[PDB]
Design a protein around this ligand. Structure first.
Ligand SMILES: O=C(O)CCC(=O)C(=O)O
Ligand SMILES: [Zn+2]
Ligand SMILES: [Zn+2]
Lengths: 250, 253
């Protein structure tokens, strides 16, 4: 019997809906492709810092691991999976991770047929004063990347703990790059002209997550974090709905 | 003050020297290229079961198994290897076998790529059962040359294994005075003997035949080709490898 929370449901070029729902129901709305992003008021104002100082929080992300090639990919994978082995036991315990493992019966993503080892669960991110999309299969080194299945409804979930003075949010475009190369090419176009031609007439959503707000979104859509004037602290992970169930990783 | 143990020190083509030695002294002589293999009597007849039953072992992918993978299966097996090592090593750290070396040499687990330092697997227990191949061990010998991330060879890399139970056969170890240059050279010797029975270069090479007994620790330069004989009954050993890095002695399996 699960908590229920105010939620704003966003979809490209349609009016933002206001609803009130469980974490489970928001994630299922996303997974059914009935929303592009959903912003929920999760943590009451006097309780935010405790989610950050959660004892279970005591690095290398999948997105960083993905940018690596050749021997460097093998080495950085050793580091990524070695850290995950060290930290996930505590991470499982945090309030943040438990939102998802309670609501979905989610478990850490695992790799290996013969022994199953965990991806990293989640990270706390601090921002101090270019578009990407996240897809578990988008390693730069195609031939060596071992995750080949793309999940169309891959989700990002981040809880904002401390907002910036400028109330710097997140932009998402109705544009879903087909691979890492495709994203590298747009980067190239941005760092050669400053624009991405295709983003011009592309439908878009503006999000302004506040502290205590959990933002859930389809991460395959191109998106960017606005520049902050001030300290921004978030906690984040990603979700894919695999054949064995919901799996978390970051 | 360190225990000394009876030791046989072997060098190719020459009579074995008997010496009582500490673990550090045998390791230093190997690292100095003053011996090819040393066999030491470590654990007396009361106690061999205890070293195996050590709670540090309860409760693996080996580096040599990892080295056999290529491309995406290498990235995958390495996740398994390093993800597993961290579960298993806290216990292994504690085992009297591993302590034998970490006490003697101030050895630590080998780590990779230290911004974060994650551990290699420390060691293994090995059961060999009745079975109707010549290899060498060198941390650099990944089959997939471009993607294997440990590109430095250590010429004094050591293998160390304690025998716990010997086959009825008294199956032991042969080591030749031959050091293959890479994983491909070794792979070609495997192709050669499967098509030929023998290995052209081995009939010119001196060989040391070893028969280590329960309780005995065999330390040797693992870059020399070696092979364990066919066992008639179950044989049990515990093993790891050592390299002497700029930061000190490191242990991995
Ligand atoms: O466990 C043993 O008998 C020795 C195995 C071996 O070949 C090694 O130590 O590399
Ligand atoms: Zn993202
Ligand atoms: Zn060997």
């Amino acid at each position: 019997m699960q908590h229920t929370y105010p939620a704003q449901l966003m979809r490209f070029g349609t009016a933002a809906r206001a609803e009130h729902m469980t974490i489970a129901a928001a994630i299922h709305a996303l997974d059914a492709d009935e929303a592009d992003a959903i912003v929920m008021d999760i943590v009451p104002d006097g309780e935010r810092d405790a989610w950050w100082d959660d004892e279970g929080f005591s690095s290398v992300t999948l997105g960083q691991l993905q940018r690596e090639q050749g021997d460097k990919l093998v080495s950085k994978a050793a580091e990524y999976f070695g850290i995950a082995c060290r930290v996930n036991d505590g991470l499982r315990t945090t309030r943040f991770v438990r939102l998802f493992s309670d609501a979905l019966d989610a478990k850490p993503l695992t790799i290996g047929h013969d022994y199953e080892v965990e991806f990293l669960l989640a990270t706390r991110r601090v921002y101090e004063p270019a578009p990407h999309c996240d897809d578990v299969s988008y390693g730069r080194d195609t031939v060596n990347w071992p995750l080949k299945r793309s999940f169309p409804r891959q989700l990002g979930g981040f809880l904002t703990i401390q907002g910036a003075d400028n109330d710097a949010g997140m932009v998402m475009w109705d544009n879903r790059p087909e691979s890492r190369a495709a994203l590298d090419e747009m980067h190239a176009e941005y760092r050669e002209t400053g624009a991405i031609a295709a983003l011009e007439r592309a439908a878009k959503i503006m999000l302004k997550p506040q502290p205590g707000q959990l933002t859930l979104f389809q991460s395959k859509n191109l998106h960017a974090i606005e520049r902050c004037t001030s300290t921004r602290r978030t906690m984040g992970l990603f979700l894919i709905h695999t054949e064995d169930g919901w799996r978390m990783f970051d």
